[PDB]
Symmetry: D2
Subunit: 221 residues, 4 copies
């Protein structure tokens, strides 16, 4: 039995997180608008929808931001076989996104299982939302720096020195109010099955908040 | 650290085997010739070549047949991390094949690592070649049945009941001598870097045989 | 990094189940009373108590029956490292039991992690209790058969043919009422820390029952 | 199937390394000679011998030093199941050592599988022997410090600061020439079946050396 990891398994509930491999370069090459591009974001949400619709697996919902998607699973696919789940889902995502962006050169996602207790499920997504936000700010800050005639290394360097408030200040000065930028850039996008139509929510609440908590709770059941 | 399998690793030498998931249905739509179609076989060999060419990983070679490819790895990618290797390679394969076949609907590979001792490396491929043969015959048997007015299930029962000799005889009666068919249908295709151009060998020797042994031995180093 | 499984981890809550290796033979040899021996049972409960008291790990409680002990863990030891947890706990159990039975020849436990959702924790132990019961009956039936001048193989053979009721009948006929045999033989023994004194309960309720449910619920918190 | 790691396996050749857990404290009570004690070393070699003799498993040989033993396995026990192998072997070792030292308080080993290519097998043991040496020197350094009126922490600081030459010099000044000490303290002990009696070699060659190479090579076959 040389296929030693082909037995490794998991238990419900689990979260599959797939992240685009080397997407910084691969998206710089093709000429995507920076720091955000609604075509790419729509491609990713459409990828998630297509997964929920035609993968033959049954996630409760997907949450996507940046170059990554997370699928909540209660019903485990492939008997919980980690290799099979990770590989198949990553492959399907690669194919789907390749279709949706009409790519001429191949791309790849990485995938990983996150084992969780049910009670922990909101926190995880909260964490992820936070990360999304932390991308948002940085993504714009960085941009502004490059627009002010800065080198890449210098921009990263300076970007580390100042914290979120100072970045807000810098961006607000130059005409960019981060609070009025679209919801999906700072909070991400939810894709879920409802009573059955698959719907994309592009205006989701902040998870750890008054409207966010029952929202997530209703998503999870 | 909820990402429990994200640290799990392997050791050289390893073989990554990716197998097309449910390729029967998802690819049936376009009308590929049955039981073998050089357009699909060329697509798979092209996928393997493209992997060797632009993945940024370094397999020694690929061996492909049916809907599957095996990559020999001595230099392990991603520090030998099983999740990352399986997911990323499967994903890249999905993307590549989606490009080469210009697919409108998404597909997926499953992937798995096969842990091996160097001494076992030839045997594995021999095993795989054997499987290829077992595919070959079977693939034709079924086909013949379809031309002779058979139900799919009807085709399954008989095919399971009789062994290779009687099947060979049937195919010869129904007009098909398997010995006149091209080498790659029964032996598969090798993709490797040679004297340096990446080359597809569509006329490979039987691995466990007098000309096959030094061939494989030179492939592996 | 040749120590590939040294990274494999888990998440709370988990149950460690250790089972005496080849204990049938090893206990037949030393001359333990069959089918139950309160000296061995006391040794096992004392082993569990000693584990809770001096292992330096922190299970919520242990449940023991036959040649096996299960430890409920909420606080995970050794960062959840499966190898380290299994090996260390198995080793400690071997040592402890070796002390308590004053053994001249070495013994071993096997160990395994059971990954569970909190909501599933009662069911598991219920399952185990059921198994305990299924041992109980069989253990006596078997005994009776050997007492009626039967060979081992014949006794097992016949034992499979009849179900629990018929066994109850057989044993009740020969003077043995299974309902009046001690609680620990049919329900097992609980060992837990209380507000801190470690106490052994040798008269536990049936878990799936009116008195059993709040009992287990109070054990788990 | 909540027992998710219970299927995880490995491939030959493998090395099981068991290391005494917290042996500093738990064994300190009896008053073992420091920094080395032939009673404990004999106990460990006896444990390895007893394992080879009555475990029912079949290692090729054991190598032991300090509080640790390594077993070379080509024939894998328990179908190569990692949980079962680690837990059972660790447990047996705990029991055996508990018997040979006649302990009143329980002890534990941790265990781990080391996956190796045959070509790597000597190197591993070389590495281990190196570790043995690094133990040896250090073990004495500390000791000397204790005789020269040092705090434990005080002993740690200096010992970390200086490298082997200066330490050698210190020990020579404080009366101890390490070259006159017995071979096993710096090289460890081998336990293997020989011409067939199970034998303990307490005078083994340096593994990576002219006489060591054919020695190890004959041990491994
Ligand atoms: N231009 C552009 N870039 C994007 C967009 N969304 C995500 N990205 C890129 O995605 C990256 C997200 O960080 P990472 O996932 O760590 O980047 P990566 O190259 O994929 O790194 P790895 O996944 O580890 O290979 C950012 O650096 C962005 O440049 C987008 O909408 N437009
Ligand atoms: N028409 C056609 N079909 C092919 C060709 N090559 C492979 N296939 C199909 O691919 C299938 C391969 O079977 P498997 O890989 O064992 O399993 P699967 O059908 O892909 O389903 P999975 O278990 O998810 O992999 C066969 O049933 C074939 O029908 C081809 O060249 N032409
Ligand atoms: N005489 C006697 N035997 C007992 C007692 N408790 C448990 N056993 C033995 O323990 C066995 C329990 O079944 P198993 O755990 O599958 O037996 P095993 O030999 O340990 O099998 P493995 O664990 O797979 O190696 C029974 O066959 C009993 O004979 C006892 O109190 N007295
Ligand atoms: N007195 C005495 N102590 C020994 C002897 N051999 C080994 N030891 C002790 O065993 C310890 C081995 O250290 P490690 O195996 O690295 O770690 P540990 O102290 O056992 O703690 P763990 O990390 O749980 O293994 C040393 O600190 C020694 O003090 C001996 O022969 N005599
Ligand atoms: Mg990325
Ligand atoms: Mg990312
Ligand atoms: Mg397939
Ligand atoms: Mg196939
Ligand atoms: Mg047992
Ligand atoms: Mg048992
Ligand atoms: Mg130790
Ligand atoms: Mg040690």
């Amino acid at each position: 039995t040389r296929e030693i990891y082909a037995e490794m398994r998991c238990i419900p509930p689990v979260v599959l997180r797939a992240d685009g491999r080397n997407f910084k370069n691969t998206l710089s090459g093709l000429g995507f608008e920076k720091p955000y591009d609604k075509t790419f974001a729509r491609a990713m949400a459409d990828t998630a929808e297509l997964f929920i619709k035609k993968s033959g697996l049954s996630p409760l919902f997907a949450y996507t931001f940046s170059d990554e998607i997370s699928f909540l699973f209660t019903d485990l696919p492939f008997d919980g076989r980690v290799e099979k789940i990770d590989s198949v889902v990553a492959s399907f995502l690669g194919s789907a996104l390749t279709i949706k962006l009409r790519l001429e050169e191949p791309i790849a996602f990485d995938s990983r299982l996150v084992a969780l207790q049910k009670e922990e499920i909101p926190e995880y997504f909260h964490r992820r939302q936070l990360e999304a936000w932390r991308n948002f700010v940085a993504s714009w800050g960085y941009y502004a720096l490059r627009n002010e005639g800065m080198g890449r290394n210098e921009a990263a360097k300076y970007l580390k020195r100042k914290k979120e408030s100072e970045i807000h200040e810098m961006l607000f000065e130059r005409g960019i109010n981060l609070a009025t930028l679209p919801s999906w850039q700072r909070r991400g996008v939810i894709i879920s099955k409802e009573a059955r139509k698959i719907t994309q929510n592009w205006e989701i609440p902040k998870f750890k908040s008054e409207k966010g908590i029952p929202f997530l709770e209703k998503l999870i059941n």
